[PDB]
Design an enzyme around this catalytic site. Structure first.
Site, mmCIF file in Angstrom:
data_model
loop_
_atom_site.group_PDB
_atom_site.id
_atom_site.type_symbol
_atom_site.label_atom_id
_atom_site.label_comp_id
_atom_site.label_asym_id
_atom_site.label_seq_id
_atom_site.Cartn_x
_atom_site.Cartn_y
_atom_site.Cartn_z
ATOM 1 N N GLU A 32 0.852 -1.193 0.000
ATOM 2 C CA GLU A 32 0.000 0.000 0.000
ATOM 3 C C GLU A 32 0.884 1.238 0.000
ATOM 4 O O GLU A 32 1.745 1.400 0.878
ATOM 5 C CB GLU A 32 -0.892 0.045 1.235
ATOM 6 C CG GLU A 32 -2.188 -0.750 1.140
ATOM 7 C CD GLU A 32 -2.109 -2.073 1.870
ATOM 8 O OE1 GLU A 32 -2.643 -2.174 2.999
ATOM 9 O OE2 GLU A 32 -1.496 -3.013 1.319
ATOM 10 N N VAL A 38 -0.833 -1.639 -4.471
ATOM 11 C CA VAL A 38 -0.014 -2.187 -5.561
ATOM 12 C C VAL A 38 -0.187 -3.704 -5.690
ATOM 13 O O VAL A 38 -0.023 -4.454 -4.726
ATOM 14 C CB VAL A 38 1.480 -1.780 -5.439
ATOM 15 C CG1 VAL A 38 2.272 -2.209 -6.686
ATOM 16 C CG2 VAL A 38 1.612 -0.263 -5.225
ATOM 17 N N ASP A 138 10.959 11.799 -0.417
ATOM 18 C CA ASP A 138 10.669 10.609 0.384
ATOM 19 C C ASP A 138 11.679 9.476 0.105
ATOM 20 O O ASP A 138 11.313 8.321 -0.162
ATOM 21 C CB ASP A 138 9.200 10.156 0.195
ATOM 22 C CG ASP A 138 8.658 9.358 1.396
ATOM 23 O OD1 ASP A 138 9.322 9.264 2.467
ATOM 24 O OD2 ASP A 138 7.541 8.818 1.258
#
Length: 279
Positions: A32, A38, A138
């Site tokens: 997730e 996914v 990220d």
């Protein structure tokens, strides 16, 4: 654009009707990623990764068109017709660096030699991103995927932007630079995050552990500086090829990356040079 258009119904079909059960149990779910789940699909003679999620959809197909590199996950295509939006990516059979470091599901520990390669691979990925004026925002071990050959591939470009401040602060806390936590937007923050990744590579420890002193991996840098411990005492025991000198060289790169003052950190190009020297 250069991407193959997919029917929603084909994508639904090849993922066993978007089977929500995890892979390890016989389903199709691989993870997730905040903006949707996914799934593994089998299309033609090919395993692919399908993200089933509108504005921040067309942003990705923008970024991904321009950002193609050996160390970035490649987008294969998309689905716009009816029900849900879908993004389709090259499938990475060795999962994430996070999981390989933790040896999740009984996978064998990584050699120091392979860890050096993955670190270099990921620095090459970031360099491309920065070269083309993109901040990832990220960078972490869970967003470093590994293909058939354990080549590092940077994924999750959801929060990627093509020094200013913002109100919507995003990223992962354990990996975030001091300034990025203050809404600042800058490539200098990707470097800080890569620094935590290198610490994970050396030590095989998670970036945060609530039962650990210290809770944040980045706080070991101060225990080493206050020589109440040494890097040697922190090296992942699950390697048999880790020479003290190359490990020390990588720790030096991590240390510099983790400069709490954004301008004193090295840029990605210097990080790249330092990792080649090491090798």
């Amino acid at each position: 654009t250069r991407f193959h258009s997919f029917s929603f119904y084909e994508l639904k079909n090849v993922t066993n009707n978007f089977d929500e059960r995890p892979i390890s149990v016989g389903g199709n779910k691989m993870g997730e990623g905040g903006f949707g789940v996914v799934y593994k699909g089998y299309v033609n003679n090919t395993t692919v990764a399908v993200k089933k999620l509108k504005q921040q959809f067309d942003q990705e197909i923008k970024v991904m068109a321009k950002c193609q590199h050996e160390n970035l996950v490649e987008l294969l295509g998309f689905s716009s017709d009816g029900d849900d939006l879908c993004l389709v990516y090259v499938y990475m059979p060795n999962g994430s660096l996070l999981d390989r470091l933790s040896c999740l599901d009984g996978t064998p520990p990584l050699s120091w030699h392979m860890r050096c390669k993955i670190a270099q691979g990921a620095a090459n990925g970031i360099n491309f991103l920065h070269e083309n004026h993109h901040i990832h925002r990220d960078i972490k071990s869970a967003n470093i995927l590994l293909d058939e050959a354990f080549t590092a591939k940077i994924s999750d470009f959801g929060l990627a932007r093509a020094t200013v401040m913002t109100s919507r602060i995003v990223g992962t806390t354990a990996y975030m630079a001091p300034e990025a936590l203050r809404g600042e937007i800058t490539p200098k923050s990707d470097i800080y995050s890569f620094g935590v990744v290198l610490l994970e590579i050396i030590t095989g420890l998670p970036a945060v552990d609530e039962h650990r002193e210290p809770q944040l991996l980045l706080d070991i840098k101060e225990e080493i500086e206050d020589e109440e411990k040494t890097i040697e005492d922190y090296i992942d025991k699950k390697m048999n090829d880790a020479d003290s000198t190359s490990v020390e060289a990588m720790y030096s790169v991590a240390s510099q990356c983790l400069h709490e003052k954004k301008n004193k950190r090295p840029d990605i190009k210097k990080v790249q040079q330092l990792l080649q020297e090491m090798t």
